Design a protein around this ligand. Structure first.
Ligand SMILES: *[C@@H]1O[C@H](CO)[C@@H](O[C@@H]2O[C@H](CO)[C@@H](O[C@@H]3O[C@H](CO[C@H]4O[C@H](CO[C@H]5O[C@H](CO)[C@@H](O)[C@H](O)[C@@H]5O)[C@@H](O)[C@H](O)[C@@H]4O)[C@@H](O)[C@H](O[C@H]4O[C@H](CO)[C@@H](O)[C@H](O)[C@@H]4O)[C@@H]3O)[C@H](O)[C@H]2NC(C)=O)[C@H](O)[C@H]1NC(C)=O
Ligand SMILES: *[C@@H]1O[C@H](CO)[C@@H](O[C@@H]2O[C@H](CO)[C@@H](O[C@@H]3O[C@H](CO)[C@@H](O)[C@H](O)[C@@H]3O)[C@H](O)[C@H]2NC(C)=O)[C@H](O)[C@H]1NC(C)=O
Ligand SMILES: *[C@@H]1O[C@H](CO)[C@@H](O[C@@H]2O[C@H](CO)[C@@H](O[C@@H]3O[C@H](CO)[C@@H](O)[C@H](O)[C@@H]3O)[C@H](O)[C@H]2NC(C)=O)[C@H](O)[C@H]1NC(C)=O
Ligand SMILES: *[C@@H]1O[C@H](CO)[C@@H](O[C@@H]2O[C@H](CO)[C@@H](O[C@@H]3O[C@H](CO)[C@@H](O)[C@H](O)[C@@H]3O)[C@H](O)[C@H]2NC(C)=O)[C@H](O)[C@H]1NC(C)=O
Ligand SMILES: *[C@@H]1O[C@H](CO)[C@@H](O[C@@H]2O[C@H](CO)[C@@H](O)[C@H](O)[C@H]2NC(C)=O)[C@H](O)[C@H]1NC(C)=O
Ligand SMILES: *[C@@H]1O[C@H](CO)[C@@H](O[C@@H]2O[C@H](CO)[C@@H](O)[C@H](O)[C@H]2NC(C)=O)[C@H](O)[C@H]1NC(C)=O
Ligand SMILES: *[C@@H]1O[C@H](CO)[C@@H](O[C@@H]2O[C@H](CO)[C@@H](O)[C@H](O)[C@H]2NC(C)=O)[C@H](O)[C@H]1NC(C)=O
Ligand code: NAG
Ligand code: NAG
Ligand code: NAG
Ligand code: NAG
Ligand code: NAG
Lengths: 125, 213, 204, 126, 202, 213
């Protein structure tokens, strides 16, 4: 009935990926176990950022599977709503940080340069 | 080849309705009816054809000059949180027109909210009880909700606005007893992400007399 | 070879799920073993729930971890000293596939209003999961007309651990207020059973 | 004089990578420009997590250049102090999430399974 | 070919940096052009600061973006219609390599204490960078001995937009309280100039 | 081959000092002095040899039975925020002993804080003014700071504790004038990340008399 739009599409991907078989329970958990350890939003957003970046990476590999394209991009918008608060700038800035190549020689030189001022505001005000 | 694009398209965002309409396209040498194709897209996504599989209504290769996303069933249509972009084109077999792309909309941001439905007023001792239904049913109340305002006044008197209040029932206490008061109910949709509001339309004026004591 | 069981089903009410299955009649009395495997446990392995039991059910309330975590159930048959292949079930989420009881409604009159108490179903009150109620659909019928109310659990001023309240103004004229309420689950929107309609009248 | 230990070591890596040449000013900024758009700590920690994960990956590639191992590992600990609040569990949980292979078939099926309950708590708590 | 300039240096006081260089004396009078390239601007290219100038200096107060962002300066020489190769400078961070003026100290007696006002240096005058003061090292010498105090800018109860205050109790007996104060920058710990020591007697 | 490992190592974390010591290693068949190698490691890092480039003091192949990381200069040594792990072994040329691995330590977490230095007390009217130096100089006050306590009591009286206070100067107001009071100053290091406190050592007893009026 009334449920967030991701629920319908997420369990559709479960069938496409056979995520409903009993063998998935093995080898502990990826995200669910860690997310319960951190209740403070500052701590949560640190972990969720890496998890959201993981799913965006995963969806990018399956951008050619037209069977699930509706479910994929529907989940992406709900992530854009729930995690980025529908802020397009927040979404685009996030996308920029991920696409940075750690092997681009030009990128690492700039990263080492900005390192000082990054550490300067790592701690809270 | 190339066809003339559909004229003056409009997206109707009233209450929970979501209807895309446009003016028909005609030709001089027309042998069979021209069809149209509607497509939708999210904030940074691919264009999808509006078919029963994608969105639950079949709006591709259709003869009609409108497409109703919310007509099929309850909870159907685009989620009111989403950043949705629609586009449209007319095609006659191999020939098709250019894409007429609508502006992006978020339903909560662009809806024109209607007045509260089924307004019932019962008089009380120097007061009036107002019960009404919400302009439309919202799935997640935490993300968006209604704030109601009542514009009441004694016959021949100056306006007074009581509100806002969250409940669908309110008591207009401290009134002159056995006197006629006229009222209007107007809603206000509040979306916490936007922190900007949609001012709803007012209901019809209706006058009632309070009780004796 | 021993035949494998068939028609494995799981039915949950108030987060007390029962496993059911069908088996053909045989000259001997077969015994069955029921094994549960939850999602979210390190190095997860099948936990035995019912061992060498002769009837066609197994109450597995003790193997329910998080009501929103998926779990699988498989059952095998033993006749004499020979066993059959396992009969595995579909994934089962207590929050999604199960059903929750109705809330208990209490009504009482005041001078200018009516205070409706919506007590949570007995599941959540006893002496940190995803599965709980997020909104209450409280239907209030005054004479012929019904209007839907919504009470959010997150509202600390309207709800607490024991109850949720709703205040409706009333007038002196004769009126019949009948109230029924239902709960909506947080993630899957599963609606609890509708409460027993409690009414009240305005004689004055 | 008295300055946080990263300053001394960061400018040492600056010389090893030739990050002091005028050519680095080209092609805008990676992190500094974005971080100025987000003042709310929730928004900051979202971006800083991606930035901190970037540096840890970069340092992992240069673990063989023994010339800079001193400068590299000092900055890592100061990140463990400033960003992870010296919480070893916070540091260790972070490393697990990063090291997950997005091409491991076993990993993506578990990720698709856990997707529902992750989305359930993406929004802030009430 | 025309000779290149030498000894390019940048000296900054109160975030007003000046570029200096040396050039050999020649029969003609050479003119120079100074070009600046800042870090942190999109599609960054060398910006002209001083154009065809005959003397050996160029004030770049207008080309200072973030006082904590590095910037580079290069300069070429023109004699007649022939130009020289550029003389590029080392990277320059105003917060790191520059120097800041002293804070203004005010002293006044109270009934049971002395109220020391530490006015922020004249740089921060209204008229959001990393570069500011995080602690104030306030040296208070009472008779023969001085003890160092620390006032953090983040303390809303001790600092405001205009000043930072410190209260020190005193007694009626003869005592000589001399106070000097300096600021420490947030990132590089660069110390500002020490304030003129102001004293007071009981 | 194999040598005996150094016996009973100790880490002295008092104020800003950081000294690793151990008992010397001797052999029955000893031809030349045994050398020692000290190594340090962070939370998740590689082992480094303690040489003039790494830490600013030379603690590899050293004859001494101790190593001082903080002797060279102010702020030299390991940063008081860092999680540092030390290990030690004795070697005589090609022969070397097993690694004696110390427990991990964070300077702010294991330090034993000393009493305030240079305590000066001057009497006042029904009060006593206390000025003192900090137990040690902290580079970043925002990450860690000191909270001081003064244990005062009239001679022959019951203990009273005024504090805590941020200033290095405090006024002991509301005292009986012209009466003898004894005081002790004790500091307490507060680290906001740990949210656990370091109880400092108390200073020597010193009694003083208030003014008459
Ligand atoms: C409901 O959905 C609607 C769509 O159906 C959403 O509507 C859009 O929202 C965005 C964001 O708020 C608006 O963008 C801004 O609008 C400003 C106003 O536009 C001006 O120009 C219009 C006409 O312009 C055209 O004609 C002129 C003259 O021929 C040409 O010179 C010009 O190039 C165009 O070809 C006028 O009709 C209008 O009245 C204004 O005068 C824009 O000015 C603005 O640009 C600003 O920002 C730029 C950088 O971001 C900057 O470079 C510019 O200089 C300028 O400062 C931007 O376009 C849309 O206008 C708006 N659409 C409509 C139709 O209003 C809507 O957001 C959503 N609901 C709600 C509640 O917002
Ligand atoms: C969505 O709706 C449109 C129309 O509302 C569907 O297109 C139409 O489908 C009908 C039935 O398939 C077609 O009629 C058939 O025509 C063939 C000859 O082409 C004839 O043999 C049949 O007996 C029948 O009359 C109709 O032509 C067609 N319209 C167009 C313009 O092609 C469409 O199929 C629907 N889409 C989905 C996914 O259901
Ligand atoms: C390099 O150029 C800049 C910009 O011209 C110079 O900065 C100027 O410095 C003065 C002195 O600190 C600032 O104060 C001014 O004071 C006078 C009166 O004393 C007043 O009339 C002005 O309105 C102003 O308040 C001034 O704001 C500042 N800017 C300008 C445009 O003058 C800088 O001094 C130069 N460097 C050197 C070494 O001269
Ligand atoms: C760190 O300090 C230790 C000792 O504190 C240094 O090791 C010692 O270095 C001295 C001088 O290099 C050696 O003495 C020399 O011995 C040679 C013969 O081996 C002789 O020809 C010289 O005239 C001089 O006497 C001493 O043997 C050596 N000790 C050991 C055990 O090897 C070490 O070099 C210092 N490290 C650095 C990086 O400075
Ligand atoms: C909603 O999504 C639309 C579709 O991407 C966005 O519209 C584009 O926004 C970019 C950046 O602002 C512009 O360069 C494009 O010109 C826009 N396209 C159109 C057709 O207008 C829109 O900005 C998004 N809005 C929000 C609030 O997320
Ligand atoms: C299945 O077994 C569970 C476990 O015994 C039952 O839950 C019990 O319910 C009774 C009735 O309220 C309580 O007295 C027990 O304390 C409960 N036990 C536990 C462990 O919670 C459950 O009712 C059973 N279901 C059926 C259908 O019989
Ligand atoms: C400080 O750093 C050391 C070095 O890694 C940590 O020591 C290990 O920590 C993990 C996780 O707590 C344990 O499983 C290991 O057994 C520890 N090793 C030893 C030798 O004790 C230490 O935990 C770090 N402390 C903090 C608070 O981060
Ligand atoms: C910056 O990007 C431009 C555009 O591709 C490229 O030509 C140039 O070499 C790059 N320089 C650096 C230092 O990255
Ligand atoms: C889990 O670990 C086992 C043992 O290494 C391995 O065989 C299996 O492929 C892993 N993946 C899953 C999804 O269980
Ligand atoms: C430049 O400065 C250096 C010292 O920094 C000095 O030795 C030299 O003579 C100066 N002139 C030239 C042309 O290098
Ligand atoms: C001396 O002999 C003992 C074994 O008896 C051995 O442990 C020790 O290392 C030897 N030392 C040398 C210098 O040969
Ligand atoms: C330092 O204290 C920590 C925390 O209690 C403890 O784990 C560790 O063993 C201590 N280190 C030493 C050298 O005593």
């Amino acid at each position: 009935g009334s449920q967030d739009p991701y629920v319908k599409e997420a369990e559709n991907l479960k069938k496409y990926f056979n995520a409903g078989h009993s063998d998935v329970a093995d080898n502990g958990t990826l995200f669910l176990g860690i997310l319960k350890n951190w209740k403070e939003e500052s701590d949560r957003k640190i972990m969720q950022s890496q998890i959201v970046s993981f799913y965006f990476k995963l969806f990018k590999n399956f951008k050619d599977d037209q069977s699930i394209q509706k479910s994929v991009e529907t989940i992406k918008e709900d992530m854009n709503v729930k995690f980025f608060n529908s802020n397009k700038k927040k979404r685009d800035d996030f996308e920029k940080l991920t696409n940075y190549s750690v092997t681009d020689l030009n990128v690492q030189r700039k990263a080492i340069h900005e390192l000082i001022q990054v550490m300067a505001e790592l701690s809270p005000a | 080849s190339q066809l003339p694009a559909p004229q003056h398209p409009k997206i109707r965002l009233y209450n929970a309705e979501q209807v895309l309409s446009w003016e028909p396209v005609a030709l001089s040498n027309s042998t069979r009816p021209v069809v149209y194709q509607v497509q939708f897209k999210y904030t940074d996504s691919k264009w999808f054809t509006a078919d029963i599989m994608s969105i639950g209504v079949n709006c591709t290769q259709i003869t009609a000059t409108e497409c109703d996303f919310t007509a099929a069933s309850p909870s159907a249509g685009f989620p009111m949180d989403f950043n949705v972009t629609l586009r449209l084109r007319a095609e006659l077999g191999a020939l098709h027109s250019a894409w007429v792309t609508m502006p992006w909309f978020q339903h909560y941001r662009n809806v024109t909210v209607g007045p509260p439905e089924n307004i019932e007023v019962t008089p009380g001792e120097g007061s009036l009880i107002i019960r009404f239904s919400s302009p439309f049913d919202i799935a997640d109340t935490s993300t968006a909700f209604f704030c109601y305002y009542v514009h009441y006044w004694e016959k021949g008197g100056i306006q007074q606005v009581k509100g806002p209040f969250r409940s669908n029932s309110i008591s207009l206490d401290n009134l002159k007893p056995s006197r006629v008061y006229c009222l209007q109910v107007q809603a206000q949709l509040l979306w916490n992400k936007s922190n900007i509001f949609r001012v709803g339309h007012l209901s019809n004026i209706s006058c009632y007399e309070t009780m004796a004591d | 070879s021993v035949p494998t069981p068939t028609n494995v089903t799981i039915e949950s009410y108030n987060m007390n799920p029962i496993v059911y299955w069908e088996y053909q009649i045989m000259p001997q009395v077969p015994v069955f073993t029921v094994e549960v495997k939850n999602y979210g446990v390190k190095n997860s392995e099948w936990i035995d729930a019912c061992i060498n039991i002769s009837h066609h059910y197994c109450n597995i309330s003790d193997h329910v971890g998080d009501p929103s975590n998926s779990l699988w159930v498989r059952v095998k048959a033993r006749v004499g000293q020979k066993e059959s292949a396992y009969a595995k079930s579909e994934e089962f989420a207590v929050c999604r596939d199960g059903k929750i009881g109705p809330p208990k409604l209490d009504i009482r009159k005041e001078e200018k209003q009516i205070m409706i108490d919506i007590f949570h179903p007995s599941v959540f009150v006893n002496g940190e999961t995803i599965c709980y109620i997020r909104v209450y659909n409280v239907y209030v019928r005054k004479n012929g007309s019904e209007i839907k109310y919504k009470i959010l659990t997150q509202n600390e001023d309207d709800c607490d651990e024991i109850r949720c309240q709703l205040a409706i103004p009333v007038s002196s004229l004769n009126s019949q207020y009948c109230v029924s309420a239902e709960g909506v689950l947080n993630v899957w929107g599963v609606t609890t059973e509708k409460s027993k309609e409690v009414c009240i009248t305005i004689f004055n």
